[PDB]
Amino acid sequence: YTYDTLQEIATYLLERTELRPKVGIICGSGLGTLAEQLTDVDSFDYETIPHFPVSTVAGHVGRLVFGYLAGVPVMCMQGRFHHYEGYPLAKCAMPVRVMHLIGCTHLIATNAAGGANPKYRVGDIMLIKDHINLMGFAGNNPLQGPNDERFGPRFFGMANTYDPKLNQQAKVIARQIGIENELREGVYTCLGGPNFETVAEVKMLSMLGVDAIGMSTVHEIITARHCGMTCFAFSLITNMCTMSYEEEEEHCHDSIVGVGKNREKTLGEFVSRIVKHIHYEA
Amino acid sequence: YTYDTLQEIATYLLERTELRPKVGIICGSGLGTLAEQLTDVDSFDYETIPHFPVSTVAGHVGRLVFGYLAGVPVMCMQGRFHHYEGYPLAKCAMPVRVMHLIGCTHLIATNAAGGANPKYRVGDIMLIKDHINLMGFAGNNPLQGPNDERFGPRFFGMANTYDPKLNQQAKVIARQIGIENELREGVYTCLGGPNFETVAEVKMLSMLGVDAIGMSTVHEIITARHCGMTCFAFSLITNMCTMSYEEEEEHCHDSIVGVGKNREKTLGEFVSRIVKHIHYEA
Amino acid sequence: YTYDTLQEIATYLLERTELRPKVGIICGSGLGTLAEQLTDVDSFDYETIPHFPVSTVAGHVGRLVFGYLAGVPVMCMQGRFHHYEGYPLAKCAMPVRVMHLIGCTHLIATNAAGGANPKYRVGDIMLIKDHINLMGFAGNNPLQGPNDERFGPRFFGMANTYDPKLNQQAKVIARQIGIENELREGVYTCLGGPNFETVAEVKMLSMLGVDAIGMSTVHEIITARHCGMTCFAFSLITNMCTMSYEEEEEHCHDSIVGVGKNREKTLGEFVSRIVKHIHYEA
Ligand SMILES: O=c1[nH]cnc2c(C[N@@H+]3C[C@H](CO)[C@@H](O)C3)c[nH]c12
Ligand SMILES: O=c1[nH]cnc2c(C[N@@H+]3C[C@H](CO)[C@@H](O)C3)c[nH]c12
Ligand SMILES: O=c1[nH]cnc2c(C[N@@H+]3C[C@H](CO)[C@@H](O)C3)c[nH]c12
């Protein structure tokens, strides 16, 4: 994906919707119903958009929806792309660069995750304060290759990547809507997958300071920071990681999506208030 | 590798052998003599099987041996494929899909490993109870890409991957044949190699909970679990990891292969009786 | 990059300089002025060398300089190649195989790094005593693929990779030139980049025993060891890693390169005394 190609995707969309969102939202496993709450919608199935990858995972509808979320224009990825589907991280992160070119100044990244922190409960929302990019340590980063200064600088720091003020405002909101007890804040990691983690892997990740284990988001976030966007992200805790050889393990994708589906009203209200906050501060 | 190509390999072999084994065995460095103890054998050089990779590593003979191991039909990879040879993990693990299509319900994977646990000794057999897939964390996984459901599900859990009942029976067997003082049980990891680990690496890997350090196996067993195969695995400790800047280090592939070669009797007997337990249990 | 191609490159240079150096030097970020202290130079822009990558990083000049360092013939990479540029590790490390083919017995690898050890100070030189190759754990190694025995063995051990005796002489030189308090010794790791590390990543890397965090060197050293070369390496600490969500982060490539430029006299004297030691001892 060159700059020119990405700008063709952006123009393609800007000619076909009048909406000019300042916020992009990526909906993960069981979070796709965020997109169903928008009004005055212009919708584009991924398989119809030039150069666009398709979502092959169940519960990822595969649709870019422009609409109003409680009156605020947003761009919504209803469905994400994952490295385990065979997509390089630059390709999974490509919509973030499209968002940036469309004029989004903010990225809200959303995902399902397993709770490696044993104090978490299924159904909790964990604010991502930080991440550990293991893929990146190994050389697998979406920014590898020639750098285009029209997007951003060759090198950049990660301080405040997960915006501290939006994280603090999300705590204020959680308490307004009565979900503070189901609200966490901690560290996310993105692993290859598609298999889930062994007991030894979960022990190692957790001792290194990981609270939530998923398979996305980090490379999306790094692409967003590269081009100057403000990021906010959260994990819905859809299952607890297996902590012992003694525990019965029942990890199931359908149940994992189910967790989010059953919380669609609360998630929608939560994201809706975050977006409201971003809009009024601007 | 498509399901159709793999089925073609399976059909090619099944047309050239009368044997219908329920157990695939993979022999690692110094374990190649397991194949030599089979009776009434149909043997296939890797060079001659369609689409098959070749063993380039010393002590890896490079042939697929169907035969009887104490009267039980087995198929045996005499020599394996390593990622450091330049094969993608899916290519290294492809024989597991062939075993499955042939009708193997069980995979026994064997390997050489450096002992990172300083309680171990050269010549110990360490039952693999669990692994840590650092390659998979970084996105290097044999299941990356489109998922064929004729093999297995998109996602799956890792609990009980190294079958607990078979590890238990291996402890029983170790007692029967006098080797309980050379029998450990612990956590394996598969590194890229082909260089051996530095002192700082070994310390980091111990602290994360690794007992045995190798360069194979993990993706073979991930491929088997995806197929729904039951897995049993062990490492022969062929050398102790260097643990200080003061220890003299003498890691040598020829010596490493020799550790297994000098234990062929015991290894054959140990593996033969696990296979026997599997046969009797169906 | 085959042996024959590498010999093409070696022969190309050997035809165009009469210098026969025994020591190769790679200059990293802020260390390029080392090449400027050479006398009687034959200089080659990377652009003009057959099959050579080019340096795209600010402050990496991109010239191979054959010259005298205080009377000792050296071969000096003024600027290097990084994986985040899009170069595979074997391509970043390729100039090390050329140095060997030319007759270099020693590699001096220098880099800039972030101080993860909080007792380090900006401007310190950390001798590399060891490294943790996280790229290699995942399978990203310059030696992956067929092995040519004309360079070295399939497998080899890492003990004393960073030469203990040269590290000892460095400590003696440090006191001779008045920089003993600014001399450290510890463990280096090579991350993919190009972004710098999160707070959570720096914490995890410290915990695992890393003192200095960089993006180069490790694969150059592994290639050198493969060839049988003696290796000496150090990091100039150009910035402290961010260790808290409360500190102000000002990671800047221009400043980083500036730390070395501001120390060119010292760096040159230090390196010049090491080469003088290698030369006398031989
Ligand atoms: O326990 C886990 N480990 C890794 N990822 C997840 C996720 C996140 N998603 C959900 C989905 C498979 O259910 C895949 O895209 C990763 C939920 N739970 C876990
Ligand atoms: O100390 C070790 N580190 C990593 N792997 C091994 C192995 C396993 N095999 C042995 C073989 C090189 O001797 C290569 O295929 C990996 C034995 N000892 C060690
Ligand atoms: O804090 C750090 N983290 C990772 N690498 C470096 C380096 C080494 N170089 C410097 C350069 C970016 O300034 C890139 O080539 C990596 C200096 N400081 C840091």
JSON list of N, CA, C and O in Angstrom, two decimals, chain A residues 1 6 55 92 115 146 173 175 185 193 214 220 227 238 245:
[
{"chain": "A", "resi": 1, "resn": "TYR", "atom": "N", "xyz": [0.86, -1.24, 0.00]},
{"chain": "A", "resi": 1, "resn": "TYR", "atom": "CA", "xyz": [0.00, 0.00, 0.00]},
{"chain": "A", "resi": 1, "resn": "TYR", "atom": "C", "xyz": [0.88, 1.26, 0.00]},
{"chain": "A", "resi": 1, "resn": "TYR", "atom": "O", "xyz": [1.49, 1.60, 1.01]},
{"chain": "A", "resi": 6, "resn": "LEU", "atom": "N", "xyz": [-3.46, 4.67, -1.05]},
{"chain": "A", "resi": 6, "resn": "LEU", "atom": "CA", "xyz": [-4.26, 4.90, 0.16]},
{"chain": "A", "resi": 6, "resn": "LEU", "atom": "C", "xyz": [-5.14, 6.14, -0.03]},
{"chain": "A", "resi": 6, "resn": "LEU", "atom": "O", "xyz": [-6.28, 6.19, 0.45]},
{"chain": "A", "resi": 55, "resn": "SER", "atom": "N", "xyz": [-12.93, -9.32, 5.87]},
{"chain": "A", "resi": 55, "resn": "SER", "atom": "CA", "xyz": [-12.99, -10.02, 7.15]},
{"chain": "A", "resi": 55, "resn": "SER", "atom": "C", "xyz": [-13.45, -11.46, 6.93]},
{"chain": "A", "resi": 55, "resn": "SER", "atom": "O", "xyz": [-14.57, -11.68, 6.45]},
{"chain": "A", "resi": 92, "resn": "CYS", "atom": "N", "xyz": [-3.38, -5.11, 7.71]},
{"chain": "A", "resi": 92, "resn": "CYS", "atom": "CA", "xyz": [-4.38, -5.02, 8.78]},
{"chain": "A", "resi": 92, "resn": "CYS", "atom": "C", "xyz": [-4.56, -3.57, 9.26]},
{"chain": "A", "resi": 92, "resn": "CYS", "atom": "O", "xyz": [-5.67, -3.22, 9.65]},
{"chain": "A", "resi": 115, "resn": "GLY", "atom": "N", "xyz": [-8.53, -12.61, 29.92]},
{"chain": "A", "resi": 115, "resn": "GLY", "atom": "CA", "xyz": [-8.00, -11.97, 31.13]},
{"chain": "A", "resi": 115, "resn": "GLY", "atom": "C", "xyz": [-6.92, -12.85, 31.70]},
{"chain": "A", "resi": 115, "resn": "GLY", "atom": "O", "xyz": [-7.22, -13.93, 32.21]},
{"chain": "A", "resi": 146, "resn": "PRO", "atom": "N", "xyz": [10.50, 1.66, 3.70]},
{"chain": "A", "resi": 146, "resn": "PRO", "atom": "CA", "xyz": [10.65, 3.12, 3.48]},
{"chain": "A", "resi": 146, "resn": "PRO", "atom": "C", "xyz": [9.57, 3.89, 4.22]},
{"chain": "A", "resi": 146, "resn": "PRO", "atom": "O", "xyz": [8.44, 3.43, 4.31]},
{"chain": "A", "resi": 173, "resn": "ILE", "atom": "N", "xyz": [-16.96, 8.65, 32.99]},
{"chain": "A", "resi": 173, "resn": "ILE", "atom": "CA", "xyz": [-18.08, 7.98, 32.32]},
{"chain": "A", "resi": 173, "resn": "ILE", "atom": "C", "xyz": [-18.51, 6.66, 32.92]},
{"chain": "A", "resi": 173, "resn": "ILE", "atom": "O", "xyz": [-19.72, 6.40, 33.08]},
{"chain": "A", "resi": 175, "resn": "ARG", "atom": "N", "xyz": [-18.29, 5.56, 35.93]},
{"chain": "A", "resi": 175, "resn": "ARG", "atom": "CA", "xyz": [-18.98, 5.90, 37.14]},
{"chain": "A", "resi": 175, "resn": "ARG", "atom": "C", "xyz": [-20.34, 6.57, 36.86]},
{"chain": "A", "resi": 175, "resn": "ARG", "atom": "O", "xyz": [-21.29, 6.34, 37.58]},
{"chain": "A", "resi": 185, "resn": "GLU", "atom": "N", "xyz": [-8.08, -1.16, 34.17]},
{"chain": "A", "resi": 185, "resn": "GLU", "atom": "CA", "xyz": [-7.09, -0.44, 33.36]},
{"chain": "A", "resi": 185, "resn": "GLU", "atom": "C", "xyz": [-5.77, -1.19, 33.46]},
{"chain": "A", "resi": 185, "resn": "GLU", "atom": "O", "xyz": [-5.28, -1.47, 34.54]},
{"chain": "A", "resi": 193, "resn": "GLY", "atom": "N", "xyz": [-1.73, -15.90, 17.28]},
{"chain": "A", "resi": 193, "resn": "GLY", "atom": "CA", "xyz": [-2.87, -16.81, 17.21]},
{"chain": "A", "resi": 193, "resn": "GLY", "atom": "C", "xyz": [-2.62, -17.77, 16.06]},
{"chain": "A", "resi": 193, "resn": "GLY", "atom": "O", "xyz": [-1.47, -17.90, 15.62]},
{"chain": "A", "resi": 214, "resn": "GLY", "atom": "N", "xyz": [-4.77, -10.58, 23.52]},
{"chain": "A", "resi": 214, "resn": "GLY", "atom": "CA", "xyz": [-5.55, -10.59, 22.30]},
{"chain": "A", "resi": 214, "resn": "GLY", "atom": "C", "xyz": [-4.68, -10.84, 21.09]},
{"chain": "A", "resi": 214, "resn": "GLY", "atom": "O", "xyz": [-3.49, -11.27, 21.17]},
{"chain": "A", "resi": 220, "resn": "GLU", "atom": "N", "xyz": [-2.45, -1.45, 14.62]},
{"chain": "A", "resi": 220, "resn": "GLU", "atom": "CA", "xyz": [-3.39, -0.36, 14.30]},
{"chain": "A", "resi": 220, "resn": "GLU", "atom": "C", "xyz": [-3.04, 0.92, 15.06]},
{"chain": "A", "resi": 220, "resn": "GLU", "atom": "O", "xyz": [-3.00, 2.02, 14.47]},
{"chain": "A", "resi": 227, "resn": "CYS", "atom": "N", "xyz": [0.90, 8.61, 12.29]},
{"chain": "A", "resi": 227, "resn": "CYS", "atom": "CA", "xyz": [0.42, 9.79, 11.59]},
{"chain": "A", "resi": 227, "resn": "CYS", "atom": "C", "xyz": [-0.26, 10.88, 12.46]},
{"chain": "A", "resi": 227, "resn": "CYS", "atom": "O", "xyz": [-1.04, 11.68, 11.96]},
{"chain": "A", "resi": 238, "resn": "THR", "atom": "N", "xyz": [-13.52, -11.31, 27.52]},
{"chain": "A", "resi": 238, "resn": "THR", "atom": "CA", "xyz": [-14.53, -12.22, 27.03]},
{"chain": "A", "resi": 238, "resn": "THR", "atom": "C", "xyz": [-14.33, -13.60, 27.62]},
{"chain": "A", "resi": 238, "resn": "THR", "atom": "O", "xyz": [-15.18, -14.47, 27.47]},
{"chain": "A", "resi": 245, "resn": "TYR", "atom": "N", "xyz": [-2.93, -26.29, 35.27]},
{"chain": "A", "resi": 245, "resn": "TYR", "atom": "CA", "xyz": [-3.14, -27.57, 34.64]},
{"chain": "A", "resi": 245, "resn": "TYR", "atom": "C", "xyz": [-4.40, -28.26, 35.19]},
{"chain": "A", "resi": 245, "resn": "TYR", "atom": "O", "xyz": [-4.96, -29.14, 34.55]}
]
